[PDB]
Amino acid sequence: MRGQIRGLEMASKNSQDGISLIQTAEGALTETHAILQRVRELVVQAGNTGT
């Protein structure tokens, strides 16, 4: 029982560090989005040929 208790708390902390890592990755994907939006805009106007 002690084994599973302590290992279960540590399993919580494991999952929590997992959350943290994912939050970092996802933040990188946020700034990825913002950039790709800029790109899309630049493409729309760049597709505004004639002017």
């Binding site: 106007q45 597709g47 040929t49 004639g50």
Partner: protein, 51 residues
């Protein structure tokens, strides 16, 4: 070689525009014409050629 303007935030939401005129912008069928229909805007007879 149309004047494709980008008008919308999506595909094919565009307007095509065309334009022409120059010295030879008088009457026309597919081209202006020979003796008439362009030189009526480039040469414009009356050098002696009405008397």
């Amino acid at each position: 070689k149309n004047l494709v303007f980008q008008i919308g935030a999506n595909a094919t939401q565009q307007i095509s525009v065309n334009i022409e005129d120059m010295g030879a912008d008088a009457l026309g069928i597919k081209e202006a014409d020979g003796s008439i229909a362009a030189l009526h805007s480039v040469n414009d007879l009356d050098v002696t050629k009405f008397a």
